Amino acid sequence: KTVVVTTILESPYVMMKKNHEMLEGNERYEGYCVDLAAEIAKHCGFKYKLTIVGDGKYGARDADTKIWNGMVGELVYGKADIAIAPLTITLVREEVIDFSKPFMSLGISIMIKKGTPIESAEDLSKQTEIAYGTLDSGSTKEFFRRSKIAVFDKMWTYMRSAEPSVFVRTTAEGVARVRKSKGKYAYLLESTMNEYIEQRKPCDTMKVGGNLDSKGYGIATPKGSSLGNAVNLAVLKLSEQGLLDKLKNKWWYDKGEC
């Protein structure tokens, strides 16, 4: 059977090619995760179809209804066979789906417009002039919501009650907000996305401070799926043969505009 791959439009993991309308199937997309999928499938010996997650989300469990949305949801409810995306390995997710060893490392980080008077999370927490928020429905939000650390609980306390909302529906929305707010908004997002955007025109944002945590993205499959074994091994192999580092440079730094 052809493996259904759920993924998500997020630069530079997966992007529409500048001419997709004249192309079909997997050929419409490009990016780090597009390249990885081809490699995973070749080594694991399967055919596959990339499909963009319907609700444009990563995956969260609705408190009350207990329904999972996003890519996680499509794996849990049987819509997809595998997720190849910047999907963060987390405990609540590991409880309902299987993750391979990480194919890329990241930490929550701070994006500012250049010249913004901010060096750290502690800095953000001690003031109110500069607003700050995170993506919706993602691991970054949950990090803050669940945190017992001082600086982080205070930040959550501010963020949850800020109005207008400091949360964004997409990474692009967050970046645009930083860019348009003249230094009055900072965005909390994963280091990988932060570093990509830092290398893109108009070159007006930067990552500041150390990361808030340390984790990674994993390739995910439905709990107990037979795919898991092969896919995990393929990730280790590709990692050892230098493919992942090659892809990272290809899509982040080789392209560099700044």
Ligand X SMILES: N[C@@H](CCC(=O)O)C(=O)O
Query: Measured from the CB atom, is 39 or 195 closer to Zn ion?
Result: 39
Q: How far apart are CA 6 and CA 187, in angstroms?
A: 26
Q: Which two tokens stand for residue 107?
A: 């930490």
Query: Measured from the CB atom, is 63 or 91 closer to a copy of itself?
Result: 91
The CA–CA distances, whole Å, from 188 to 63, 80, 140, 147 equal: 23, 29, 7, 15
> Choosing among Zn ion, a copy of itself, ligand B4D, none, which partner's interface includes residue 103 (Cβ < 5 to 8 Å by kind)?
ligand B4D
Q: How far is the CB of 111 from ligand X (least distance, A)?
A: 11
Q: How far is the CB of 103 from ligand B4D (least distance, A)?
A: 6
Closest C-alpha among 168, 195, 176 to residue 110: 195
> Choosing among ligand X, ligand B4D, a copy of itself, none, which partner's interface includes residue 237 (Cβ < 5 to 8 Å by kind)?
a copy of itself
Query: Measured from the CB atom, is 135 or 186 closer to ligand X?
Result: 135
- The interface with ligand B4D within residues 34-93 (CB under 6 A) comprises 89-90
- Does 64 bind a copy of itself (CB under 8 A)? Our answer is no
Part of the chain binding a copy of itself (CB under 8 A), chosen from 1-9, 62-70, 94-102, 125-133: 94-102
> Choosing among a copy of itself, Zn ion, ligand B4D, none, which partner's interface includes residue 59 (Cβ < 5 to 8 Å by kind)?
none
Q: What is the DSSP letter of 168?
A: B
> Of residues 2, 67, 105, 258, which one binds ligand B4D by CB under 6 A?
105
- Does 34 bind ligand X (CB under 6 A)? Our answer is no
- Does 135 bind ligand X (CB under 6 A)? Our answer is yes
Helices (H), the chain: 32-44, 70-76, 91-94, 121-125, 139-146, 150-161, 171-180, 191-198, 227-240, 243-248
- Does 101 bind ligand B4D (CB under 6 A)? Our answer is yes
Closest C-alpha among 125, 126, 101, 127 to residue 212: 125
Q: Using the CB atoms, write b or e for 90-117: b if 16+ within 10 Å.
A: beebeebbbbbebbbebebbbbbbeebe
Beta-carbon contacts of residue 49 (< 8 Å; ≥ 6 apart): 2, 3, 4, 5, 25, 26
- Residues 156 and 140: beta-carbon distance below 8 Å: no
- Does 244 bind ligand B4D (CB under 6 A)? Our answer is yes
Query: Residues at the annotated binding site?
Result: 86, 88, 93, 139-140, 190
Residues in the annotated binding site for L-glutamate: 86, 88, 93, 139-140, 190
The residues that touch ligand B4D, with contacts defined as CB under 6 A, are: 89-90, 101-105, 214-216, 218, 236, 239, 244-245, 248
